[PDB]
Scaffold this motif. Sequence first.
Motif, mmCIF file in Angstrom:
data_model
loop_
_atom_site.group_PDB
_atom_site.id
_atom_site.type_symbol
_atom_site.label_atom_id
_atom_site.label_comp_id
_atom_site.label_asym_id
_atom_site.label_seq_id
_atom_site.Cartn_x
_atom_site.Cartn_y
_atom_site.Cartn_z
ATOM 1 N N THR A 98 2.379 -2.642 -3.478
ATOM 2 C CA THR A 98 2.806 -3.349 -2.379
ATOM 3 C C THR A 98 1.442 -3.768 -1.686
ATOM 4 O OG1 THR A 98 4.973 -2.767 -2.241
ATOM 5 C CG2 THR A 98 3.919 -3.307 -0.186
ATOM 6 N N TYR A 99 0.578 -2.729 -1.187
ATOM 7 C CA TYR A 99 -0.570 -2.667 -0.568
ATOM 8 C C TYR A 99 -1.561 -3.815 -1.245
ATOM 9 C CZ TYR A 99 -5.064 -1.912 1.783
ATOM 10 O OH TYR A 99 -6.390 -2.236 2.206
ATOM 11 N N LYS A 100 -1.822 -3.438 -2.575
ATOM 12 C CA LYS A 100 -2.846 -4.580 -3.092
ATOM 13 C C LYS A 100 -2.254 -5.995 -3.298
ATOM 14 C CE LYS A 100 -6.903 -2.808 -4.532
ATOM 15 N NZ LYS A 100 -7.963 -3.554 -3.658
ATOM 16 N N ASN A 101 -0.877 -6.319 -3.094
ATOM 17 C CA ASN A 101 -0.582 -7.678 -3.324
ATOM 18 C C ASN A 101 -0.602 -8.253 -1.891
ATOM 19 O OD1 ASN A 101 0.121 -7.382 -5.932
ATOM 20 N ND2 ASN A 101 2.197 -6.790 -5.624
ATOM 21 N N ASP A 102 -0.671 -7.345 -0.791
ATOM 22 C CA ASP A 102 -0.527 -7.817 0.708
ATOM 23 C C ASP A 102 -0.963 -6.837 1.449
ATOM 24 O OD1 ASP A 102 0.987 -9.014 3.246
ATOM 25 O OD2 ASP A 102 1.312 -10.487 1.458
ATOM 26 N N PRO A 103 -2.561 -6.764 1.469
ATOM 27 C CA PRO A 103 -2.981 -5.519 2.122
ATOM 28 C C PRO A 103 -2.749 -5.873 3.962
ATOM 29 C CG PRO A 103 -4.537 -6.303 0.596
ATOM 30 C CD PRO A 103 -3.345 -7.141 0.605
ATOM 31 N N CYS A 104 -2.779 -4.637 4.595
ATOM 32 C CA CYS A 104 -2.819 -4.833 6.080
ATOM 33 C C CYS A 104 -4.331 -4.531 6.454
ATOM 34 C CB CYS A 104 -2.113 -3.426 6.505
ATOM 35 S SG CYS A 104 -2.319 -1.795 5.757
ATOM 36 N N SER A 105 -4.517 -5.278 7.553
ATOM 37 C CA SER A 105 -6.054 -5.259 8.095
ATOM 38 C C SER A 105 -6.331 -4.634 9.462
ATOM 39 C CB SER A 105 -6.448 -6.696 7.942
ATOM 40 O OG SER A 105 -5.488 -7.550 8.510
ATOM 41 N N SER A 106 -5.450 -3.457 9.504
ATOM 42 C CA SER A 106 -5.431 -2.903 10.894
ATOM 43 C C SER A 106 -4.784 -1.570 10.872
ATOM 44 C CB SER A 106 -4.660 -3.865 11.779
ATOM 45 O OG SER A 106 -4.036 -3.341 12.787
#
Lengths: 72, 72, 145, 147
Positions: B40-48
């Motif tokens: 889930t992270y690697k498909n749509d990382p957060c930036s914060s």
Amino acid sequence: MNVDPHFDKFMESGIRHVYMLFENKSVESSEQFYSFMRTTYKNDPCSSDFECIERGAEMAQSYARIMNIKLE
Amino acid sequence: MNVDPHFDKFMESGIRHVYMLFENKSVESSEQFYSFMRTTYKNDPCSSDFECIERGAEMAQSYARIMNIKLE
Amino acid sequence: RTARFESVALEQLQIVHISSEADFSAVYSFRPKNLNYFVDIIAYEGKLPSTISEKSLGGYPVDKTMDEYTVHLNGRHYYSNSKFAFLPTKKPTPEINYMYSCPYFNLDNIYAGTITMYWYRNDHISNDRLESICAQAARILGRAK
Amino acid sequence: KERTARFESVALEQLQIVHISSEADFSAVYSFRPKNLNYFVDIIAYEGKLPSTISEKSLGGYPVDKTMDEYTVHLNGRHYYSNSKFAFLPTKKPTPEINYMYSCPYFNLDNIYAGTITMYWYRNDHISNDRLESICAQAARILGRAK
């Protein structure tokens, strides 16, 4: 990182006191050097900050003479 | 650490708010969990930080409900 | 070995180089895995700065204490006028006026290198376009391993 | 793969040596997962009397709290000892029945923090920290090569 603090002392000392004087740095020269520093360490690990800073130096220094590596 | 610091905030949020309440922890249960969090992270990382803390928790709880994992 | 990462490091640096309209652009890559003792250039675009021109661009030691390393572990981008931690030389490179860079993290979520843009002229597009060009390529290298 | 299964054979060998010569009440080998990341800790082998707070439940897939002293003391190169803090014991409850823990990290072929050898006592007489040190250190060298 989560590195062996003793190998990382020993390795960093090897790099800063010797490996950075190498006149010919390349991919496989760093990997030969890493492979020697890693195997040397793992067969007889140094146990402390002061012991590692100085076994790393003089072993990288040995490596330089063994495989006959140009310095300065 | 030299871990991606945004994934780390994200993964530790899910651990400290949800996974810690899993009544049946195991080698497998923790394997599936990290595998879901990494995908889930690697498909749509957060930036914060604030985002990562908050998405990590929701995804975890969502994984929990999806897999029907007992909490409390 | 499995290459494949370098096929993707090429494609993305192409996009990064042209979109940023930089003079010189490079993908740096750390070794060994998760210890980052050495840094290589595995792909560059543009014309090499005079300090690395006819010299090996691989196996250069990593100073983990320079700003860029620590800044990338905090998760922000780095830019600078005169500090090129990873550029494979001890000599300064004053012909560089500006450097912008962003970390990329591999499939195990570990600092694995950088994507870096260099300017010889003191003009360059906005840092905000630099960021989004950078982050979109960072995300792709991260998935590639 | 079954790299871990080979490491478990060595882990069981070295734990036997540690438990008996240390005279501990309870001995464990802990093993972090995933490689390099350490979000989870598992007992992969133990000896002795399971403390009540971890009987009859799973000793795998417990989460790692990296703010606890032992994790950072290990990464700073020291052994860890305490009479109350059991960072890795797979339980969120305190375990007052334990009088003393002693542990030393081990690190794998890649020089990453990969787990711990820990001894536990329920009496409050334990052999000196100095003996446990070299007992723990010699088994740590061997686990480190076992990949």
